[PDB]
Design a protein around this nucleic acid. Sequence first.
DNA 1: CTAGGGTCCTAGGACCC
DNA 2: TCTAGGGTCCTAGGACCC
Length: 340
Amino acid sequence: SRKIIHVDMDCFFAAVEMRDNPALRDIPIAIGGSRERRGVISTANYPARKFGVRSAMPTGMALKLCPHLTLLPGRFDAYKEASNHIREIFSRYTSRIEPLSLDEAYLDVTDSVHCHGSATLIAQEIRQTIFNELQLTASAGVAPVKFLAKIASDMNKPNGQFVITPAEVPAFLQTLPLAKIPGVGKVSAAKLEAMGLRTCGDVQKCDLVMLLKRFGKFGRILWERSQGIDERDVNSERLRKSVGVERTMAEDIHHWSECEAIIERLYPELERRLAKVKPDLLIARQGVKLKFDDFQQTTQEHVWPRLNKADLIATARKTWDERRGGRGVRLVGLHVTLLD
DNA sequence: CTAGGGTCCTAGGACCC
DNA sequence: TCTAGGGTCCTAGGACCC
Ligand SMILES: Cc1cn([C@H]2C[C@H](O)[C@@H](COP(=O)(O)NP(=O)(O)OP(=O)(O)O)O2)c(=O)[nH]c1=O
Ligand SMILES: [Mg+2]
């Protein structure tokens, strides 16, 4: 009975760079760390996507695929300001807004009577207003539940939208690959595949008890989504639970002196961020993370009442001594868990 | 050749009745 | 606690999203 819109900015980071500097519009560009910083692609424009460049791709791999790729470091304040403006635009239509990141959000427009209650037309006018006021484009999905609205906002990217009507949900589900369902990633998909389950169609012919056994709470979400069942309400009141800061070295470190020097560079950053939402720096836990050169990672965290540099250093020394094992370390991170 | 923000779930032992 | 076991907290790790 509800109407959910999922709105999604196209090539968001890249799109802001291209607006601000038009000479980037028709050449392949990407935001991400450089190859020597051991970077990863955050996102790429469509001329770069043509070459196979994707989010989360190692920058070294992107550059082999697209040698003339232009790498930008990214400008958070620019993306943030675009994001605020966009969210303020959503607020013109409803207060039922659940942001999932800078670039996107769910809207529950069930009880709105903008555009004669048309969720299709509301989505259209939001995309138009965003183009008008920010010169960036958005795609949208309109559906009776969250996850279908989110899948839908991809159907007609870029700068388009897609509507899934209650009567259309069954045909839509029947051939929908499980991997397109939010929270079904590569490991899940492959495990499902090895059971003969590829599509929501397949999952409908499956015993619930049995999915509960092999997958726990995940198996129930699976069975529900496959039916088109998604009762999760649009929640406009979510609050951040943690604050973390980490860096990957251009080169693996092998000595503790190097590790402590990195922590001293991280700590002020963790403190400035935490203070932004907790001026008194009071927290529930603090902890450290190490990532080794074989990519295993370990965290050590404990109840602690107030952000403290020396105890983070101390904690990192124990973690360093105990679980490094002569391995090179590629990443150091600090972490706090916020009070409830 | 593998980022940096995060969220949510699982699970053994401690701890408390 | 009335006794074999139930509930909740602490911690580490993993899958996942953007
Ligand atoms: C998936 C992803 C996104 N991001 C950043 C860059 C994207 O511009 C932004 C929004 O994420 P998205 O909506 O997943 N991707 P997009 O907006 O670039 O592309 P699309 O047009 O939505 O397909 O978040 C990363 O920094 N690393 C990532 O792995
Ligand atoms: Mg997007």
